[PDB]
Amino acid sequence: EFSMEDLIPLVNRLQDAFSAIGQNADLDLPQIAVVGGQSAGKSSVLENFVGRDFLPRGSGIVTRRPLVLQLVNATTEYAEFLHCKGKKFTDFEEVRLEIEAETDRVTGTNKGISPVPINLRVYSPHVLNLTLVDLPGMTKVPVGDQPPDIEFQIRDMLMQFVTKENCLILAVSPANSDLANSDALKVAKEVDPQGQRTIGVITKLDLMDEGTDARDVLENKLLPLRRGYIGVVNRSQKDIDGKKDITAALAAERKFFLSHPSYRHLADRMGTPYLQKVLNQQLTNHIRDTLPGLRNKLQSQLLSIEKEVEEYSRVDEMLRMYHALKEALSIIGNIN
Amino acid sequence: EFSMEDLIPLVNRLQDAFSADLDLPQIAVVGGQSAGKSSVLENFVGRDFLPRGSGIVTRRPLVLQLVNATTEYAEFLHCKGKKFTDFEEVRLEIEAETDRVTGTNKGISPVPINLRVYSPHVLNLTLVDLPGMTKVPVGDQPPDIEFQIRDMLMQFVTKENCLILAVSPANSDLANSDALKVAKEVDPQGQRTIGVITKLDLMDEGTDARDVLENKLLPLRRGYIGVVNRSQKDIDGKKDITAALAAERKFFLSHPSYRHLADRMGTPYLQKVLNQQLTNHIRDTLPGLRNKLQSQLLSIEKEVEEYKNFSRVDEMLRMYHALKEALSIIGNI
Numbered sequence: 194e195f196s197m198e199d200l201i202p203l204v205n206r207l208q209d210a211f212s213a214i215g216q217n218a219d220l221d222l223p224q225i226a227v228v229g230g231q232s233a234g235k236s237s238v239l240e241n242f243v244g245r246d247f248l249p250r251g252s253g254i255v256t257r258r259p260l261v262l263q264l265v266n267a268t269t270e271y272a273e274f275l276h277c278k279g280k281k282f283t284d285f286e287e288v289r290l291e292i293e294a295e296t297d298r299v300t301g302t303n304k305g306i307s308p309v310p311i312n313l314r315v316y317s318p319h320v321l322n323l324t325l326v327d328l329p330g331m332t333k334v335p336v337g338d339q340p341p342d343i344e345f346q347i348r349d350m351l352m353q354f355v356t357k358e359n360c361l362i363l364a365v366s367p368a369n370s371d372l373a374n375s376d377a378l379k380v381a382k383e384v385d386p387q388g389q390r391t392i393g394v395i396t397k398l399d400l401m402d403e404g405t406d407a408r409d410v411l412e413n414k415l416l417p418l419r420r421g422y423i424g425v426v427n428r429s430q431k432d433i434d435g436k437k438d439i440t441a442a443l444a445a446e447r448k449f450f451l452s453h454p455s456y457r458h459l460a461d462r463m464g465t466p467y468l469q470k471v472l473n474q475q476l477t478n479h480i481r482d483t484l485p486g487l488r489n490k491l492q493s494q495l496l497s498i499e500k501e502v503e504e505y506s507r508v509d510e511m512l513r514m515y516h517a518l519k520e521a522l523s524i525i526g527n528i529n
Numbered sequence: 530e531f532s533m534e535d536l537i538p539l540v541n542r543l544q545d546a547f548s549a550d551l552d553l554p555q556i557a558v559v560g561g562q563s564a565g566k567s568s569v570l571e572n573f574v575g576r577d578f579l580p581r582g583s584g585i586v587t588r589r590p591l592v593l594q595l596v597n598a599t600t601e602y603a604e605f606l607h608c609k610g611k612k613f614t615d616f617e618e619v620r621l622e623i624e625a626e627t628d629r630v631t632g633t634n635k636g637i638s639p640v641p642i643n644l645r646v647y648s649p650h651v652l653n654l655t656l657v658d659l660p661g662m663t664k665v666p667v668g669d670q671p672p673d674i675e676f677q678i679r680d681m682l683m684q685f686v687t688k689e690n691c692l693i694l695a696v697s698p699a700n701s702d703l704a705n706s707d708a709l710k711v712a713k714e715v716d717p718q719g720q721r722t723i724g725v726i727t728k729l730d731l732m733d734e735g736t737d738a739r740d741v742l743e744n745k746l747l748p749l750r751r752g753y754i755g756v757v758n759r760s761q762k763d764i765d766g767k768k769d770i771t772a773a774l775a776a777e778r779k780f781f782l783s784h785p786s787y788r789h790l791a792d793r794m795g796t797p798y799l800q801k802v803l804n805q806q807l808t809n810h811i812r813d814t815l816p817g818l819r820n821k822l823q824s825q826l827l828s829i830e831k832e833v834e835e836y837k838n839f840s841r842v843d844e845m846l847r848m849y850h851a852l853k854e855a856l857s858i859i860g861n862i
């Protein structure tokens with residue numbers, strides 16, 4: 194009867210301890226990271242997991258730092274950032290502003306990026322028990338005052354997440370561009386050739402040119418993926434501006450698939466609700482099969498933290514990682 | 530007084546004789562797959578002869594020589610002696626010839642298809658249609674298709690007299706532009722890169738490309754020109770060029786973010802600018818062209834000098850005469 198719930202007690206502690214001191218890139222915990230070109234609609238897809246407006250979204254470069262989003266099912270609903278402990282947020286608009294402010298603090302407002310992640314934990318009776326990673330979208334040419342190698346700084350940042358064995362890759366591609374043009378799929382095939390942990394998501398289906406559709410892609414025929422593709426339709430910029438809510442966006446999406454002559458026959462396997470259901474199941478299957486591997490990785494990190502203790506505030510930080518790992522090992526050893 | 534018309538007697542003689550080493554003036558399109566490149570080039574003629582569509586369509590370079598003339602017809606260097614009057618047959622030939630040399634359903638070939646179109650409504654210049662860049666192979670395409678396509682483009686855009694039409698679709702952030710990335714690589718100073726923004730009619734409600742079109746997001750010396758070409762539905766319905774141009778004109782005049790730029794937007798404006806830029810570009814580098822020709826003449830002269838017996842020989846002589854004639858012509862301009 195294994196589920197993500199069983200991992201919650203250990204994931205929670207480990208994330209605090211490691212990400213707190215900039216070592217987030219050490220743990221190989223189960224998570225789902227979003228990859229794709231700039232403005233493909235990645236943050237819009239992730240935001241739906243919470244059901245509230247809280248992630249900065251928009252055309253042009255908006256997400257500029259990774260966001261490690263820990264979702265925990267709980268009776269009450271509130272959010273907390275690792276960078277400002279003690280402060281609990283109930284207003285999701287204020288959560289959005291803090292992500293924007295924390296991003297600007299480090300990356301400025303002249304379009305730069307930073308691989309330092311913002312860690313946010315959200316407790317809600319409506320969410321699944323998953324960790325999502327929002328990431329800046331891949332680009333080809335620098336604009337404004339971005340550095341000349343911005344494309345590679347962005348790729349490097351994403352690679353650090355997606356090369357991990359327990360990271361499910363959500364390869365996001367916009368319907369209004371040929372799939373052959375997909376930066377998400379190129380990246381995904383490079384790190385996960387067999388497609389064992391890659392899921393395709395086609396966004397912006399409502400923006401396709403008249404007389405065309407993505408049926409061949411959605412039926413998994415154009416470029417087959419082991420895990421298939423799921424189509425979604427999120428809010429346009431006009432919608433965001435006009436304050437259309439998620440409940441209304443979801444209804445428009447359901448109607449879109451049921452009434453589109455190219456997709457009606459696939460409607461049951463399309464949409465945001467379906468994507469979230471499938472992602473949860475896929476992550477559950479992945480970790481169920483890789484639990485021994487996770488235990489062995491934590492055993493390795495523990496061996497590593499021990500050696501580091503003897504080499505020596507920084508002591509407190511290391512001890513917190515040490516105890517979280519010891520506890521994680523005990524908890525995981527009891528999971529079947 | 531100098532105009533592309535002055536080069537017609539020269540360019541045609543040379544092209545015919547040479548069958549690269551010739552750096553003749555031309556305009557090449559670069560961009561991601563299905564950015565709208567072939568659709569842009571087709572407007573230079575207006576006879577639905579270029580295969581267009583979503584998915585990979587253009588799969589071989591097409592070197593298209595346009596010549597203003599009283600009669601309208603076309604010739605393919607590979608179909609010697611046959612003059613095409615039916616443009617649908619022309620479109621079908623491009624398709625068949627593409628299948629012939631690529632030898633695959635979706636792969637490409639860098640061997641160009643040479644086509645010349647005579648028409649009373651065309652400018653006098655050469656356009657090069659090219660497959661769009663991709664990232665992942667589909668169907669029977671080779672695993673390195675991305676690099677085979679980039680290599681193919683490079684064959685044209687590294688040339689000194691090749692103007693680069695960097696085509697980027699408006700429905701994708703400019704920062705994602707394969708076109709501008711390649712243009713910057715082969716032409717850092719932008720002396721020969723002209724930006725074209727297609728699919729302006731497809732942008733998400735609530736957004737616009739004003740900063741791109743005002744040359745502020747990623748400035749180019751030559752600027753950016755926005756166009757609105759026919760959709761796939763329109764193509765399938767055979768919408769004519771006249772209707773497409775009127776809808777384009779209406780789009781810019783009615784869009785609140787672009788109306789103030791209307792006099793420098795659109796297909797007619799793009800073609801005027803392209804012609805002028807190509808004319809200026811070659812007018813200023815004419816002595817350079819002359820030397821390029823002269824070096825090939827002097828070279829071939831020595832070899833042809835000892836010719837005195839008795840179709841490689843015939844081909845060599847034709848190049849000699851063509852080069853010798855071109856030299857005289859250019860010398861008078």
Ligand SMILES: Nc1nc2c(ncn2[C@@H]2O[C@H](COP(=O)(O)OP(=O)(O)O)[C@@H](O)[C@H]2O)c(=O)[nH]1
Pocket residue numbers: 230231232233234235236237238249250251252255256330396397398399400425426427428429430431433733734
């Ligand atoms: N019409 C439409 N617009 C969308 C869709 N998904 C996202 N957008 C818009 O695309 C832009 C980019 O969204 P964002 O989620 O910030 O993408 P990200 O940069 O890749 O995280 C915003 O202006 C969204 O309103 C979609 O399915 N349909």
Ligand SMILES: Nc1nc2c(ncn2[C@@H]2O[C@H](COP(=O)(O)OP(=O)(O)O)[C@@H](O)[C@H]2O)c(=O)[nH]1
Pocket residue numbers: 402403560561562563564565566567568569580581582583586587661727728729730731756757758759760761762764
């Ligand atoms: N709505 C719209 N569709 C366009 C526009 N330009 C091209 N298209 C469509 O985009 C697709 C690609 O056109 P094509 O010229 O073949 O691009 P190429 O592959 O880059 O040569 C076709 O389905 C065209 O109908 C445009 O400005 N607006």
Ligand code: ALF
Pocket residue numbers: 230231232233235236251252253254255256257328329330331
């Ligand atoms: F704002 Al982005 F990829 F363009 F998150």
Ligand code: ALF
Pocket residue numbers: 561562563564566567582583584585586587588659660661662
């Ligand atoms: F058909 Al293309 F670039 F996709 F010419």
Ligand SMILES: [Mg+2]
Pocket residue numbers: 235236237249250255256327328329330
């Ligand atoms: Mg984002």
Ligand SMILES: [Mg+2]
Pocket residue numbers: 566567568580581586587658659660661
């Ligand atoms: Mg084409």
Ligand code: NA
Pocket residue numbers: 231232233250251252253254255256
């Ligand atoms: Na964006």
Ligand code: NA
Pocket residue numbers: 562563581582583584585586587
């Ligand atoms: Na195409």
